[PDB]
Symmetry: C11
């Protein structure tokens, strides 16, 4: 079961080599920091797909060990909220890494939307930072200053396009259901 | 039993592939977000049926680790409520993902209905976000802003009428009762 | 035993199919929401019987993880009470789902009866929300607003009539007691 | 031992079919609601006997998870008390149901008798609500507004006469003592 | 050991049949109640002997889950005390029932004797309510109004004369000591 | 070990028979309650020897689940103390009974001796009440008012005379010391 | 090991017989109660030696479940202190008895020596009360009013004389050191 | 290992006999106490060595269940401190005894050194009282007034000269190092 | 599973040799300390990659034992925040080291990013210090002042230029997916 | 493993005999008590080496069950600090001893260095006090006044000159590496 | 795994003998205390390398049981901070030692940098003091005064030159990867 599943030699060796790879510019987003340098980052859903592909859908796991609301301050009808979350990522063999993420919302008049923004971003932030610890392929490169301006010296690539033809159109999945019947 | 059954290679392979698939326009709704443009999301019952079909009715599970009422504010005879929930989804082999969901009710005059909406929406929101982490087919595609733009480039779908003919007639389920009898 | 009984393939598949089924109008009720539209729902006693038929009387279970009284307000000789309950449903193999339910009492002069209503409604509501996570047949179809529009397609049903001719009238259940019976016949 | 004892096919089958039965008018009582309609209910001692015959004296069990006094209010020389109880019923195979019951005492001048009445009524009420989850025969039919209509269409009959000719008059139970001796 | 001693069929069937029996008038006591008819009840020492003969001295057990003094009120030099107790009864196979009992002392001037009376009555009251869940012979018949009516029609009998001829007079138990010795 | 044994049929049967016996007047003492008639009781040291002879010195056990001082009141230089104890008796096979005992000291001027008397009597009182749940021979007969009236029809014999001839006079126990050596 | 050592038939039977013995006047001491008559008691060091000879130095054990200082009162430069202790005695097979002891110091001018005396006496007192539940030989006889009457009718005899010729004078115990070496 | 190692028949009977011995005057010290009494005691280091020779360096153990500072009082630049300790002694077979010890410092002007003396005396005192329960040779004779009377009727002896010729002068220990190597 | 796999003979030997190696100048950065000379440190992402390469992506793990915010101080519109974190690193055989890290924000005008900065740096700061404990190659050399001297005596090396040709381009990992497939 | 490793017959005999040894003057130090006599003691490092040689570096262990700061008093610009520590020492077989140590700093003007001194010396003091319970050789002789008399009659020996020729000069220890590599 | 691996005879004997060694002056630093003696110590990183080499990178482990900030004092724009930490060191066989360390910062004007310094010093301080318990080779001789002044009698060496040629320059580690691949 999960946490007691020891890696085979072949699967171990493949995953080790795979994690060294750095991410191409298709993976990286940007936004200029307020008053300062354009911070590069990876979007949450890309990290999840990376992990799901790196380890398998049943190969990694994550939980929220703790989340905490540091402050909600009201100044002239506007809200300022910071939230941290502690996120622990685990693999099928028991391996694990845990890190902190943070979340911010300032200036909205809805207290709710402030807290919703902060509480949510704190978690994925923690999830991304936790996953980085497994190697380059899950975001560990994003902070290598040498790697970064290498990306800036690459031609600005126009976004991809997804082909929604063979997209999932019904709930039913006969291929899995067949395989699952052979499980019980 | 649950938390123990290892995936077979057969079932693992099928589910691994199945989860990569993106979701068609059948699955996406749109509201009008606070202060911003059209926001896409998936309604809860679709996530449920996706999961139930992806993993089996007994193949996945979820619990509420915690739910906190952030505030109940009375301003202009209307109640403003924010609620978070932490929802952990687990599969039959012990693999798991947990995330936060949030629930908001602003402007209703019923304190009761405000608390009810926020508490109930916090839970569903957390269940969806937790399920996302398993892959595209359970909602991870919804945030790929490239997927969303390609989604608008398809003809508008019309409400598919559901054929209620073979609807469940009696409580009784004879095939189940036969199978359940011989399981003893 | 319960929590450790794994489903046979012959049983797993039947339930998997059966849970996909949508519910006919025999299962659906409606009432006037406060200030708004017709809201459809399934009554608690039907969800219970659905679960009993889907899983067996000993195939599913539920517990109250927590109940909290959000407020008891007194306004003009009337009480306002809101209560949540966290209800966790489990099947005999350990799979489980948990959700929140809510309960409301507005306008009563009895605080006691206000709390009684809210606390109980919260639990039954939470039980239903947890069971429906298992599929359409336990109530997950009720929210598909294509399903609801299709429901308004069938002519409104006549209420079913209960035939009490074979109603249970004594505690004894010979058929049940017989299944337990052991002859105890010895060798001599 | 209790909680670890699987149902045989024969016992499972008989109980599953038996629990579907609706209850005859012998089981049903009625009471004046304050300001409102006749309320039908089943008396506790009748549910206990139903459970003992359905499951065996050692086939079911119940405990009080928690009881809380919601309030003790004194208004115009009378006490007003509400009490909730959380009652969990379990069968010998480990299956279980838990529900809340409520106990009310309005108008008595003794705080003692008010609390006694509400505390005990809460437990019994919770026990009844928990057992009803197993099926019609244990009380799930009482809320079925169609069931209640057919009950009204039956001739209102006599009360039963109990024949105390075979009533227990002595503590000793030779059949039990024989069976228990032969078991060590 | 206790809690792990599954019942044999021969003892189960004997006890299940035996618990159905109603109790004769030898078991029932009466007091006139305020605002109602005579109230019937069974004295504690009779329930204990019923339980001992039904299950064996080592076949049933009880503990006090909790006892709570609801209040000690001093009014007019007199004490009003209400106490509840939660009592859990278990059989040797692990079967169990738990209930609340209540204890009342109103009008006494000694706080000590008020608390003593209410605390003890609460435990015994709770034990009686728990044991009657096992069936009619342990007191569940006492609440059946039809049984009660039939009891009233029964000839009233003068108390039993107790024959102290072979009352225990010395501590030693030779048959017990012999049996205990053999077993080591 | 203790709690994990199991009675042989022989010991079970002898003890079940012996516990039914009622107690002769040798065991019964009496005191006039404050303001009321005579109360009959069994002295603690008698209950202890009954239990030791009934069950063996290593066959029964007791612990104090809890002791609570209800109040220490000083009124006109006199102390009023009420104390309860919860006492659980267990037999070697794990069966158990728990009850409450109460201890009272009213009117003394020494606070030390008030607490001492109440605390100790509460424990002995609870032990007596717990052991009597095992049957008549351990005190359950004391509540049989018919048993009591039958006792009054017996002229009270003179206090027994104790023959201190074969009294233990040195610590050493040769019979015990011989057996203990062989058992290693 | 301790708590797991079932008694052999021989050791059980010797001890059962030995514990019935009443104690000679060599064991019994006396004091005067405050304002009243003679009170007999057994000194701690004699109860310890009784237990060691009855059960073996490794056959019984005791622990302090709890000690509470009920009060430290200062009256005209004199301290009044009451302390209770809960003491649990266990035999090598797991059987056990627990009781409360009380310790009193009145009138000393040192608060320290008041607490020391009270704390230590409560523990010894609790040990005495717990051990006496095992039978007459460990002190249960002292409360028998008939035993005390017979005891006061025996000759009051001379203080014993201790022969210190065979007293231990060096730490080493060659007989013990021999046996212990032949055991590893 | 410790707590698990049962006693052999030989080691048991060696220690049982040996523990009966009363101590010679080499072990006994005396201080003067308030009110003129001569108080006899055994010094800590002698009790430790007695225990080490009776049980082996690895045959007994002790822990501090709790230590509490009852009070630190300042009167006229001098401190009054009382400290208790609960000390539990265990033998290698699991048998155990626990007792309270008390530590006192009165009259010192250094608060620090008062607390040091008190905390340290409580622990050693508690160890002495705990070891005492195993028998005379570990101090139970100290409280016997007959033993004490007999000690005075003995001629006094010069303090024994200790011969440091064979005293350890280097850390290294060849005999053990040889034996320890042969074990791994 | 993780924490349960004991190192092979030569895996140990290779890692034991490898960890002694000192780090080259490619790894070291420097920030001008406030008011003082150069302080050298190693950036988080390189330590992570060092650890991943030293032990394998699944060979080491880390968790945040605790994090605390020592202070958030507001002085003239500037925020001062200190945060500590305790980080525990574990190897696949259970070996572990734990240490503290610290995080600081001085001078920012935003409360949120101040807390964000401090909490996040404390964690990674805490991660490095713990990993350093495994040997020179994981950061233990940075504190050797001779090692730092020899570093300045080295040619001032230009930054790396990472070759983004073989950068990871798509989520899917066929070699891993193949190896993962054949492990079920 | 540690805590579970029984002593061999030969090693037990060696350590038992070895521990009797009294310590030569090489181990003993002295000091002035404030206004007090000559206090003899053993320095911390000497006990550490004594234990390491007596039991093996892996034969004994210790932990701080608790440390508590009794007071930090500021008197005349000087700090007075008292700190206790509870220290538990364990041998590889599960044997253990726990004792209290105290640490004192009086007269320093730095609060920080005061607490440091007290906290540190309490631990060493407690470790010494716990170790000495194993026998004379580990420090139990220091309290024997007769032992201390012989120390005076022995020539005041000089502080030994230590030969630093064979001092360890490099981290590497090749001889150990052979034996450990041989083990995996 | 770690904590469960017993030392081999060969490895024990190597480590025992090796730990005896005293450390050369290459290991020792010196800093003069304010107004008093020059105090010798060992730098943290040297102890780590000593420990890593003495026991192996996987042979020893350490954790922080607790860290406390005793006080944060601001006097005239300067911060005074004292911090203690309790650090527990364990070997692969379960052996352990724990000690307290302290961390000091006085006179800095930045609260953040003061607390950072103190928290980090206490851990390293505690780690060194715990390790010194394994023998002289890990720092136990540093306090031996004969050893200390003997250190000055040695030619004061200037720091040896570190050779950065063979420094680890890339992350990749081929030798370990070979052994790591075959370990599966």
């Amino acid at each position: 079961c999960f946490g007691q599943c020891q890696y085979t030699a072949e699967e171990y060796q493949a995953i080790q080599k795979a994690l060294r790879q750095r991410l191409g510019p298709e993976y990286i987003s940007s936004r200029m920091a307020g008053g300062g340098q354009k911070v590069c980052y990876i979007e949450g859903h890309r990290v999840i797909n990376l992990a799901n592909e790196m380890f398998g859908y049943n190969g990694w796991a994550h939980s929220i060990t703790q989340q905490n609301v540091d402050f909600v301050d009201l100044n002239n009808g506007a809200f300022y909220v910071g939230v941290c979350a502690f996120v622990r990522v685990q693999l099928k063999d028991g391996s694990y890494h845990e890190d902190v993420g943070y979340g911010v919302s300032e200036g909205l008049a809805s207290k709710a939307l402030s807290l919703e923004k902060a509480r949510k971003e704190a978690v994925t932030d923690g999830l991304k930072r936790a996953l980085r610890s497994f190697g380059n392929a899950l975001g560990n490169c994003i902070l290598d200053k040498d790697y970064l301006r290498s990306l800036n010296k690459l031609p600005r690539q126009l976004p991809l396009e997804v082909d929604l033809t063979k997209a999932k159109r019904q709930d039913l999945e006969p291929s899995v259901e067949a395989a699952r019947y052979n499980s019980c």
